[PDB]
Design a protein around this nucleic acid. Sequence first.
DNA 1: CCGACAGCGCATCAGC
DNA 2: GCTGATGCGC
DNA 3: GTCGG
Length: 314
Amino acid sequence: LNGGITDMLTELANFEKNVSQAIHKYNAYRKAASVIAKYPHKIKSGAEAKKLPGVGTKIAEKIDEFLATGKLRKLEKIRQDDTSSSINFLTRVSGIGPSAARKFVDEGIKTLEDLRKNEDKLNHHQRIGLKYFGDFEKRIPREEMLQMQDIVLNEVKKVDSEYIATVCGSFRRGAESSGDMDVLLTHPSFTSKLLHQVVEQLQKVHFITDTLSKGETKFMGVCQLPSKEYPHRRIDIRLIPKDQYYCGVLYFTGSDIFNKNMRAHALEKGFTINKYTIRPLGVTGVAGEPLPVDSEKDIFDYIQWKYREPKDRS
DNA sequence: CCGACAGCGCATCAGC
DNA sequence: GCTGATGCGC
DNA sequence: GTCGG
Ligand SMILES: [Cl-]
Ligand code: NA
Ligand code: NA
């Protein structure tokens, strides 16, 4: 219906984020692109789109130019600009943000090949990002996600049967494909080397292949199913305290729209929902001590809601 | 008119 | 050497 | 860039 418009807005969004370094303009374009994508009519004018929440004067004007000419002069110029397009492209490498991309392009390093012959200028993360550039941009079919879950749940329980691990994100919502694997981890001995032992076992059975970052609570790395040959995949593992675990599962399961609606409804019922804890608000707005949570349902019961299945959380 | 627009873990830099 | 800021991803 | 106090 409006794919030409949403691609335009998405392309504008990236350039604001990657080149202009205007993160708020980036989100504004994405928000507009998103609301337009859910609009069930073929937009005929900018004024029509202006009615939608997140679409203001400037975007309405851009849509008018797009509907009348089939293009955007501003975009056409940006696409042909060597500096801007190179900066924009380099940010696709995990570990290279707008700042690093700008530095590289300043030094004549503009392509994937330029990065390869300039390894000395790349940090550890960026080298991993360069190494698996293609693989990281691939989606992960649910069948592989299931096999990945099998390995993670098996090895985690092997380290200690008292661990609790949940694969969250879109996979838990029942998506047929995922961008990465997000694992939440907890243990009864952890409340408000547990993570290391789990990471160590997973790289012992050669599931985890690389490490982007690793601390006491958060691991970010690369993994691969055993074998053609499966592409390397992004995997994160978070160690969360037991009393904050199910607030974490709720949050990291999503979706974003669902979390917003649930947080808003929580306010009207007199509660505030964090990624960590759920707390009651006093008459003056003073938040009290965190409420005891032992499951996802408890959060819904606190704010008088029927437990929503992850499958229905859009 | 003009401030909010999420916030945090980890890696690594800038200053001392 | 340490502390705080910055970049990055999410 | 858009919304809203
Ligand atoms: Cl809190
Ligand atoms: Na609007
Ligand atoms: Na990047």
